[PDB]
Design a protein around this nucleic acid. Structure first.
Ligand SMILES: [Mg+2]
Ligand SMILES: [Mg+2]
Ligand SMILES: [Mg+2]
Ligand SMILES: [Mg+2]
Ligand SMILES: [Mg+2]
Ligand SMILES: [Mg+2]
Ligand SMILES: [Mg+2]
Ligand SMILES: [Mg+2]
Ligand SMILES: [Mg+2]
Ligand SMILES: [Mg+2]
Ligand SMILES: [Mg+2]
Ligand SMILES: [Mg+2]
Ligand SMILES: [Mg+2]
Ligand SMILES: [Mg+2]
Ligand SMILES: [Mg+2]
Ligand SMILES: [Mg+2]
Ligand SMILES: [Mg+2]
Ligand SMILES: [Mg+2]
Ligand SMILES: [Mg+2]
Ligand SMILES: [Mg+2]
Ligand SMILES: [Mg+2]
Ligand SMILES: [Mg+2]
Ligand SMILES: [Mg+2]
Ligand SMILES: [Mg+2]
Ligand SMILES: [Mg+2]
Ligand SMILES: [Mg+2]
Ligand SMILES: [Zn+2]
Lengths: 64, 71
RNA sequence: ACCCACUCGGCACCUUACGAGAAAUCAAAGUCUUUGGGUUCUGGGGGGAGUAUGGUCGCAAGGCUGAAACUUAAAGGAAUUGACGGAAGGGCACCACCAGGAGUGGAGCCUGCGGCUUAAUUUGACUCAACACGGGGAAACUCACCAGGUCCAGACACAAUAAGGAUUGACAGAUUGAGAGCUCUUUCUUGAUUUUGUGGGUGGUGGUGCAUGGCCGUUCUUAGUUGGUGGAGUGAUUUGUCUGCUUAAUUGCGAUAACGAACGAGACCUUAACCUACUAAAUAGUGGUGCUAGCAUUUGCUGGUUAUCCACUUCUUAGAGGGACUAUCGGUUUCAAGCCGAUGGAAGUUUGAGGCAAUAACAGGUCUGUGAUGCCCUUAGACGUUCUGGGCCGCACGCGCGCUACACUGACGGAGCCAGCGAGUCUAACCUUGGCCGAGAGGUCUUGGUAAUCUUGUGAAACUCCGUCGUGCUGGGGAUAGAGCAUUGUAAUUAUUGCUCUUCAACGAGGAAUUCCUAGUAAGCGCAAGUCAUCAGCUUGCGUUGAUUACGUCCCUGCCCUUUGUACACACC
C-alpha cells in the first residue's frame, strides 16, 4: 500500500526518427510531509527517549 | 501474395461530352427571341432550366433526376 | 631394543614473514633503482618453424647444428567476477513422489490444433511457458480469406485544361445480383467546389514482435540486491552476504574481521471470520398494540394488513473502535531462534484466501487493441473503403481441453423444499412480477424497478420423502435421423436456439501412459456474470452437499544453493 501512498509513476512515448523510446518516471515523496495521510512508512518505529533521573531522596511531602 | 489476374477489359469512366451548347434559342429579325425546348414548372427550377427531348420523354436535368413531364 | 637432551649430515612437512613477486606463491623465488660474492647456460612480440639449406652423426627411424622471404596486433601469464558442464555435496515442492482420492487416456458428442480438401476453407501461437488461448461462442456485420460490383474520403504546392464551360448529377431504356447513371444510348442539368500531370501526402487486420514503445508471460509455489565505517588485496574484487541450526522467507538464532543499515521478504492493503459494547435505520428487521382470518376454546396456536400507533437494534446493513501477540501452562531443542502438545479462544497452518512485489534474464508472445511506432511494401484495374454472395463449420484420419455415460448409493413419477456472488430501460425498449390463452415451447393484456425499495425469499441443482421399475444394452445411455410447432434477426438452406411425437447407436469402468489435489479443501451439484439480436458443452466468480488419505521423505521428475573445471564473456544456440 505505501506504493499507492508515496510513489508517483508516469510513462511517456517519445517518438523519434529511428523508432520510439519510452520514458518511465518514478518519484518517491517524503512521507513525513504527507499532510493528508500516513506521515511515515508502516515500517517506522520511533522509541521516545527517557530522561536521566535524579531519584533517591528519602520521603518528604509538600503542602498547599 | 500473388499480384495480378484479369481476363482483360478494364472499365473506363465518363466524358460529359463537348458541345458549345446554348444555341437553342431563336432570335428573329431584330431582335425578338423565342426559346426552343420547353422549360420546367417546378418550384425549385425557376423556368431557366429546360426539358430534354428524348422519345415520349421530356425531362428536367435540373431536378438532378426528378420529375417526368411528357407531351 | 626403547626413552630423554644435544650435535653434524639427509628425505620432507608444519607456522609465519622481516623480505620477494604480475599474481598463484616462495627459507628461496629473500638479503635488487639503498641496483656488483664466483661461474656456466638459454630467451628478446606472435606466426612462418624447429620448416628450408649446408655440415655432421646414424643401418634405418631419425639426433645435433639451424635460417630467411612473407605474414600478423596481438599471441601469452596470473588472479577476479560471471556464464555454463553429460563432476561432487547439500536442499526445496502434490505444476515432485509417498499415503490416497477424483479422474483423463477406451465410447458418443462438444470444442480447439494438425492434416487433407477447397474459389477461399483468413491468421497468430507448437515442451512446462502452443492446442475452451488471441477474451477467438464467425449466419450479415465482425473479416483479415474467396467469386464479383461502387466510391475517393487522392490534404496541400506548381503546372495544364477552361467561362465560347474546368467539372457535377440524372429519369427511362440497355445493362446488373440489385430501384448502382458502373458502363452505354439519348440530352438536359451543374458553374470553377472538380478533372489531367508532376511533386507531396494519405489510408491499410500489408511485411518485419530478428527494427521499437507499451503491455504480458516465463525464470519465480523463487529469495535474492546494495551502500556506509572497519578488516583483506597493487588491482579487478573480497569480507559483511557464513560450517550449523532454524523459517514459507538472506526468516531468525548462533558462529564470527566485522559493526550497524537500506531495497526485495516482512510490514502494508483487500476480503472472509468474532462483538446482546458505540452511532443509526418505512430502501433491513424484531417485540408490543390496534384492525382482522382459521382452528381451539381456559388464557392458547398459526396467518393477513410499505405506515393505525409505540419501543427496541439480537438478527441485516456500514461507520468508528475493540480483538490475537502462536496467549497461558507444559515437553523438546546448543533449554538460542524455534518446533511440538494440552487449556482457553471467534479465530492459533503467514488466522484462511488474495492484492502489491526488488535486481536481472528471454531475440518468450503481441505491429491483428490502439489516431503507439521506424523502415519496406501498396495506393484508383487499390493490399483504401464499401455493397452483394460464399468461406472461417468444409472430412479417409493423428493430437489436446471438455460434456454426457455405462445404472439399483440408480432411472423415472409424484411430494418435500433450501443458497450465495450478480445484473438491469433516456432520450429507451433493459430486468420482468401479476391476469388470461396455449400440451409445450411461446403468445397476449397489464404492472413494479435507473433499484437493500421492483424482478427476487432469484422456492437453483444435487438433496430429502412415498411410490413404479428389478438386473435384462433394461424403463441404464441418448448419439444419429424423420416429421410438425414456435422464438431471435433484414436474413436461419450448410438444420441459431427453444418445444412435441418418433427413431434408440457406441458405451458393461476402459492398454501403454497421464492430470489435479491436504479442510469447508477434493469430489458431486447447480446459479450469476463476461460474451450476447439470437447461440455455453467455455470462462470468471458464487454458494449448496461434503469425504478418504499425508502432516512425511529425496525414489522419480523440476528447480535453487555450495564446492569444483573452463581456452566460454555475442557467455554451450
Ligand atoms: Mg574461476
Ligand atoms: Mg501416488
Ligand atoms: Mg488410475
Ligand atoms: Mg511471424
Ligand atoms: Mg461481406
Ligand atoms: Mg497526385
Ligand atoms: Mg507517386
Ligand atoms: Mg494500422
Ligand atoms: Mg520479443
Ligand atoms: Mg516487447
Ligand atoms: Mg503447495
Ligand atoms: Mg585498502
Ligand atoms: Mg555469497
Ligand atoms: Mg447489531
Ligand atoms: Mg479447543
Ligand atoms: Mg522470436
Ligand atoms: Mg501492440
Ligand atoms: Mg476457427
Ligand atoms: Mg488450457
Ligand atoms: Mg427424483
Ligand atoms: Mg393448441
Ligand atoms: Mg414505470
Ligand atoms: Mg434400451
Ligand atoms: Mg434416459
Ligand atoms: Mg449468459
Ligand atoms: Mg472462449
Ligand atoms: Zn425540374
Amino acid at each position: 500500500q505505501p506504493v499507492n501512498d508515496f510513489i508517483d509513476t508516469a510513462t511517456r512515448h517519445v517518438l523519434m526518427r529511428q523508432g520510439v523510446l519510452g520514458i518511465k518516471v518514478k518519484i518517491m515523496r517524503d512521507p513525513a510531509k504527507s499532510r493528508t495521510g500516513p506521515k511515515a512508512l508502516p515500517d517506522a518505529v520511533t522509541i521516545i527517549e527517557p530522561k536521566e533521573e535524579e531519584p533517591i531522596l528519602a520521603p518528604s511531602v509538600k503542602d498547599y | 501474395k500473388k499480384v495480378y489476374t484479369t481476363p482483360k477489359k478494364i472499365k473506363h469512366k465518363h466524358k460529359k461530352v463537348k458541345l458549345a451548347v446554348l444555341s437553342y434559342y431563336k432570335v428573329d429579325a431584330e431582335g425578338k427571341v423565342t426559346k426552343l425546348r420547353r422549360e420546367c414548372s417546378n418550384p425549385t427550377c425557376g423556368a431557366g432550366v429546360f426539358l430534354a427531348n428524348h422519345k415520349d420523354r421530356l425531362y428536367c436535368g435540373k431536378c438532378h433526376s426528378v420529375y417526368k413531364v411528357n407531351a
